[PDB]
Enzyme design. Structure first.
Site, mmCIF file in Angstrom:
data_model
loop_
_atom_site.group_PDB
_atom_site.id
_atom_site.type_symbol
_atom_site.label_atom_id
_atom_site.label_comp_id
_atom_site.label_asym_id
_atom_site.label_seq_id
_atom_site.Cartn_x
_atom_site.Cartn_y
_atom_site.Cartn_z
ATOM 1 N N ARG A 212 23.618 41.361 49.728
ATOM 2 C CA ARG A 212 24.400 39.992 49.517
ATOM 3 C C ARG A 212 25.820 40.460 48.781
ATOM 4 O O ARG A 212 26.811 40.037 49.147
ATOM 5 C CB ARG A 212 23.584 39.106 48.684
ATOM 6 C CG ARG A 212 24.299 37.727 48.554
ATOM 7 C CD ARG A 212 23.605 36.662 48.029
ATOM 8 N NE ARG A 212 22.646 37.001 46.686
ATOM 9 C CZ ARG A 212 23.488 36.842 45.566
ATOM 10 N NH1 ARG A 212 24.466 36.587 45.503
ATOM 11 N NH2 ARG A 212 22.653 37.378 44.386
ATOM 12 N N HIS B 6 27.292 43.379 48.246
ATOM 13 C CA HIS B 6 28.102 44.486 48.437
ATOM 14 C C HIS B 6 28.038 44.915 49.817
ATOM 15 O O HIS B 6 29.074 45.948 49.983
ATOM 16 C CB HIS B 6 27.460 45.625 47.527
ATOM 17 C CG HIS B 6 27.846 45.462 46.085
ATOM 18 N ND1 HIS B 6 26.881 45.395 45.193
ATOM 19 C CD2 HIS B 6 28.981 45.278 45.331
ATOM 20 C CE1 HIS B 6 27.186 45.442 43.984
ATOM 21 N NE2 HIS B 6 28.684 45.120 43.814
ATOM 22 N N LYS C 248 33.169 36.119 39.180
ATOM 23 C CA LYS C 248 32.893 37.597 38.814
ATOM 24 C C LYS C 248 34.226 38.377 38.832
ATOM 25 O O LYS C 248 35.110 38.193 40.218
ATOM 26 C CB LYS C 248 32.060 38.086 40.198
ATOM 27 C CG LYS C 248 31.482 39.446 39.698
ATOM 28 C CD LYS C 248 30.604 40.027 40.696
ATOM 29 C CE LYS C 248 30.100 41.477 40.580
ATOM 30 N NZ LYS C 248 29.069 41.732 41.702
ATOM 31 N N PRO C 249 34.419 39.321 37.903
ATOM 32 C CA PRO C 249 36.005 39.650 37.645
ATOM 33 C C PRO C 249 36.149 40.636 38.743
ATOM 34 O O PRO C 249 37.547 40.631 39.531
ATOM 35 C CB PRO C 249 35.750 40.412 36.426
ATOM 36 C CG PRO C 249 34.868 39.488 35.612
ATOM 37 C CD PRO C 249 33.857 39.231 36.696
ATOM 38 N N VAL C 250 35.185 41.435 39.267
ATOM 39 C CA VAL C 250 35.402 42.301 40.385
ATOM 40 C C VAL C 250 34.454 42.670 40.919
ATOM 41 O O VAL C 250 33.247 42.592 40.633
ATOM 42 C CB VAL C 250 35.999 43.908 39.713
ATOM 43 C CG1 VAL C 250 37.293 44.047 38.910
ATOM 44 C CG2 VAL C 250 34.856 44.353 38.686
ATOM 45 N N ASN C 251 34.620 43.160 42.481
ATOM 46 C CA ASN C 251 33.718 43.388 43.296
ATOM 47 C C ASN C 251 34.095 44.030 44.701
ATOM 48 O O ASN C 251 35.118 44.169 44.838
ATOM 49 C CB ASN C 251 33.184 41.988 44.022
ATOM 50 C CG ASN C 251 31.526 42.254 44.458
ATOM 51 O OD1 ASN C 251 30.767 42.694 43.899
ATOM 52 N ND2 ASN C 251 31.433 41.841 45.828
ATOM 53 N N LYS D 281 27.586 55.510 35.187
ATOM 54 C CA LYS D 281 28.460 54.975 34.263
ATOM 55 C C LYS D 281 27.707 54.772 33.093
ATOM 56 O O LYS D 281 28.171 54.957 31.926
ATOM 57 C CB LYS D 281 29.379 53.789 34.891
ATOM 58 C CG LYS D 281 30.516 54.356 35.423
ATOM 59 C CD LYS D 281 31.519 53.116 36.271
ATOM 60 C CE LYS D 281 32.591 53.324 36.995
ATOM 61 N NZ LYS D 281 33.329 52.297 37.605
ATOM 62 N N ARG E 240 39.719 41.497 43.308
ATOM 63 C CA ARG E 240 40.035 41.714 41.603
ATOM 64 C C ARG E 240 40.445 40.227 41.508
ATOM 65 O O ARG E 240 41.515 39.658 42.193
ATOM 66 C CB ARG E 240 41.161 42.785 41.346
ATOM 67 C CG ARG E 240 41.402 43.014 40.124
ATOM 68 C CD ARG E 240 42.438 44.066 39.787
ATOM 69 N NE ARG E 240 42.481 44.844 38.603
ATOM 70 C CZ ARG E 240 42.916 45.942 38.150
ATOM 71 N NH1 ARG E 240 43.882 46.363 39.042
ATOM 72 N NH2 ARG E 240 42.976 46.433 36.985
ATOM 73 N N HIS F 155 22.478 48.813 43.004
ATOM 74 C CA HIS F 155 23.813 48.661 42.325
ATOM 75 C C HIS F 155 24.958 49.764 42.783
ATOM 76 O O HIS F 155 24.971 50.529 43.125
ATOM 77 C CB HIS F 155 23.314 49.282 40.706
ATOM 78 C CG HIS F 155 24.707 49.229 39.773
ATOM 79 N ND1 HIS F 155 25.096 50.305 39.481
ATOM 80 C CD2 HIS F 155 25.337 48.285 39.440
ATOM 81 C CE1 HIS F 155 26.035 50.394 38.678
ATOM 82 N NE2 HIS F 155 26.308 48.913 38.732
ATOM 83 N N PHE F 156 25.999 48.851 42.933
ATOM 84 C CA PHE F 156 27.320 49.520 43.215
ATOM 85 C C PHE F 156 27.825 49.969 41.891
ATOM 86 O O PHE F 156 28.272 49.399 40.954
ATOM 87 C CB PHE F 156 28.159 48.697 43.826
ATOM 88 C CG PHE F 156 29.278 49.576 44.387
ATOM 89 C CD1 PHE F 156 29.379 49.731 45.949
ATOM 90 C CD2 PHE F 156 30.627 49.482 43.823
ATOM 91 C CE1 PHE F 156 30.409 50.421 46.513
ATOM 92 C CE2 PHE F 156 31.645 50.404 44.419
ATOM 93 C CZ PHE F 156 31.680 50.693 45.727
ATOM 94 N N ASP F 157 28.342 51.377 41.786
ATOM 95 C CA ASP F 157 28.635 51.963 40.437
ATOM 96 C C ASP F 157 30.257 52.146 40.459
ATOM 97 O O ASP F 157 30.706 51.685 39.603
ATOM 98 C CB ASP F 157 27.811 53.240 40.046
ATOM 99 C CG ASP F 157 27.932 53.341 38.543
ATOM 100 O OD1 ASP F 157 27.458 52.580 37.855
ATOM 101 O OD2 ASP F 157 28.041 54.685 38.294
#
EC number: 4.6.1.18
Length: 123
Positions: A9, A11, A40-43, A65, A84, A118-120
């Site tokens: 959902r 990514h 959400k700040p970044v995706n 990370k 962004r 998770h997208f790192d």
């Protein structure tokens, strides 16, 4: 919602000839429920097939990370779109800059089956 489903959902946006308009992130961040609680700040959205992204869990093992060892980098570059948050963006009207890219992705994998959760990073 499972962790695997959450990754899909947040990514995944599989498409051939991906051509994300200047409006793309504004629409997608809303439609994928990423602007319900806060902006959400970044995706990042990935435009390759689910099969191809799932395959990354068997590719190059790299440090996460956060220091965990369950992260994997894609051997080939992938079509992606970065979102962004802008300076003028004000909840509940979250506003985003849309930037298309072709880069290697790094994901964290967990479970049985071993799938992305998770997208790192993109590199």
């Amino acid at each position: 919602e499972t962790a695997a489903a959450k990754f899909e959902r947040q990514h995944m946006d599989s498409s051939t000839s991906a051509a994300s308009s200047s409006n793309y992130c504004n629409q997608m961040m809303k439609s994928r429920n990423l602007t319900k609680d806060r902006c959400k700040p970044v995706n990042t959205f990935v435009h390759e097939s689910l099969a191809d992204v799932q395959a990354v869990c068997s590719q190059k093992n790299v440090a996460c990370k956060n220091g965990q060892t369950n992260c994997y980098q894609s051997y080939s570059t992938m079509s992606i779109t970065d979102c962004r948050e802008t300076g003028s963006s004000k909840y509940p009207n979250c506003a985003y800059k849309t930037t298309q890219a072709n880069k290697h992705i790094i994901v964290a994998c967990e479970g049985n089956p071993y799938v992305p959760v998770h997208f790192d990073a993109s590199v």
